Design a protein that fits this description.
Strand order of the largest sheet of chain A: 1-2-3-14-6-16-5-4
Pfam family, one (chain B): TauD
Protein name (chain B): Alpha-ketoglutarate-dependent taurine dioxygenase
Number of strands of chain A: 16
Largest sheet of chain A: 8 strands, mixed
CATH superfamily of chain A: Clavaminate synthase-like
Number of domains of chain A: 1
CATH class of chain A: Alpha Beta
Number of helices of chain A: 7
Catalytic activity (chain B): taurine + 2-oxoglutarate + O2 = aminoacetaldehyde + sulfite + succinate + CO2 + H(+)
Bound molecules: 2-oxoglutaric acid, fe (ii) ion
Binding site for 2-oxoglutarate (chain B): 124, 253, 264, 268
Oligomer: homodimer
Distance between the termini of chain A: 38 Å
Order of helices and strands of chain A: EEHEHEEEEHHEHHEEEEHEEEE
Cofactor (chain B): Fe(2+)
Largest interface: A-B, 20 and 19 residues
């Protein structure tokens, strides 16, 4: 593989890449750059790549160990890959800013989304840079946040009252809650590789900053959750059938619009595991 | 005779008995009165039927007094302002504020005397800037210490409320010119005790200049609420002839406007203060 065409969709986050057939493995000249592409633009987009779960699970394992979701349905015979089929009976639930599975000791470092069945229009998906948003913070503020820890809870994005349709569904929730208690993650996170600083909190799971008072936390989080929706921090993608999206889950957050029902939307996703989030001067 | 100092709480306010403010106080009495004001930030003395003069004489022992260019004053004592509120001059102090912080040298304190009062209502409350600051977590203390905030005249006196007649629209424009926005420490070090205290008030503070606009809005939103917490306050129910002495350097106060159509008359002495500063 000679090289790849990387087109930045913005100065901070965004990149549309081509010249990379994702149905068949790739060399080591290609991976490096594609790897460093996602590690550079935080989230890259590759089009026209009609690949099946196994193919998706394949590449995802090239980045690292994959993670299995405790409540979301998986594709047939393919646990590793979770399926997001949405309709009137199964409303969308990712229309909130979040960072995939930060409720575990070592949150996923990346993920690969793939469009299967898309509605006529809608279902756009956004990503926001945790590193930009940090840079946008005044010095006095970085000093404040850096060093503080914030709790993450599975229940915040998955409440019991939302998993009682059946007794099975309820049982699965109870188990998932059990294996995932609330735990701490730095407000400011140092990227394992780059070493760049980034805001590591997200509305989907962060319940509170334990290092300050309850109301100081409400006020700080109330600011951070708004701060990250600033346009200049994000890239927006309009989906098209058979499309690939790979992003770094250590320094970003995404949001998936809910505006296509009663139509049906089907997405497949691979979830690469990562290390222990941390902070360092 | 030592004065009786009864604290009204663990952080702020106290009621003092044993002092006859109608006559000069001995060194021993003024000193324990002075020190009680620094300690409790706001003290109250009841049954003190004094004259403006006698009030001025007491205020002059705390520092220079202000002669107000507008507000009317007592019989023949320019230093004693008359705050006469009723239906044709409604109360306008029912908001948390620190007096005239929009000038380089906000008053160091004041002496308020209740001349005439509504049958009920008119309660005035003070909130402790010291207790509020110390109730912050170490990370907020280090954040707010050293930051500066803008204090604007126009935040308490908005242009949209002075547009009726084009007359009181230019005298507004004029006021706004004689009092431009200026800065103060977000955390003020008391000139005497060296105690640190939050020094913003929503009557005049418009924003922290040392951080972003949004960050400022979030911080102030928090601080304007944090200081209204019950634990940091003392509430006073007035009685005719009450005297209240407070340290405007580290507190804020709020006067309830819930007694019209009844009439309320207070006499006030304003004590000029020095420059507000922060020193670690
Ligand atoms: O449906 C999408 O486009 C994204 C869904 C999502 O938030 C995820 O897979 O983590
Ligand atoms: O009327 C009062 O009791 C207090 C009014 C006031 O805010 C002041 O004198 O500064
Ligand atoms: Fe997601
Ligand atoms: Fe006042």
């Amino acid at each position: 593989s000679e090289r790849l065409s990387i087109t930045p969709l913005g100065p901070y986050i965004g990149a549309q890449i081509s010249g990379a057939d994702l149905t068949r493995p790739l060399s080591d000249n290609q991976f490096e750059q594609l790897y460093h592409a996602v590690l550079r633009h935080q989230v890259v987009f590759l089009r026209d790549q009609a690949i099946t779960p196994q193919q998706q699970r394949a590449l995802a394992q090239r980045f690292g160990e994959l993670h299995i979701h405790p409540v979301y349905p998986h594709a047939e015979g393919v646990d590793e890959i979770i399926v997001l089929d949405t309709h009137n009976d199964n409303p969308p639930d990712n229309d909130n800013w979040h960072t995939d599975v930060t409720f575990i000791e070592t949150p996923p470092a990346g993920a690969i989304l793939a469009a299967k069945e898309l509605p006529s229009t809608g279902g756009d998906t956004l990503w926001t840079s945790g590193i930009a948003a940090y840079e946008a913070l005044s010095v006095p503020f970085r000093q404040l946040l850096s060093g503080l820890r914030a709790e993450h809870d599975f229940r915040k994005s998955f409440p019991e009252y939302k998993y009682r349709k059946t007794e099975e569904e309820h049982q699965r929730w109870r188990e998932a809650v059990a294996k995932n208690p609330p735990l701490l993650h730095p407000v400011v996170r140092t990227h394992p590789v780059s070493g760049k600083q980034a805001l590591f909190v997200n509305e989907g799971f962060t319940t509170r900053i334990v290092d300050v008072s309850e109301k100081e936390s409400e006020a700080l989080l109330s600011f951070l959750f708004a701060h990250i929706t600033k346009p200049e921090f994000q890239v927006r993608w309009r989906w098209q059938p058979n499309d690939i999206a790979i992003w770094d889950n250590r320094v970003t957050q995404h949001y998936a619009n809910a505006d296509y029902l009663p139509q049906r939307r089907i997405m497949h996703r691979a979830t690469i595991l990562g290390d222990k989030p941390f902070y360092r001067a």
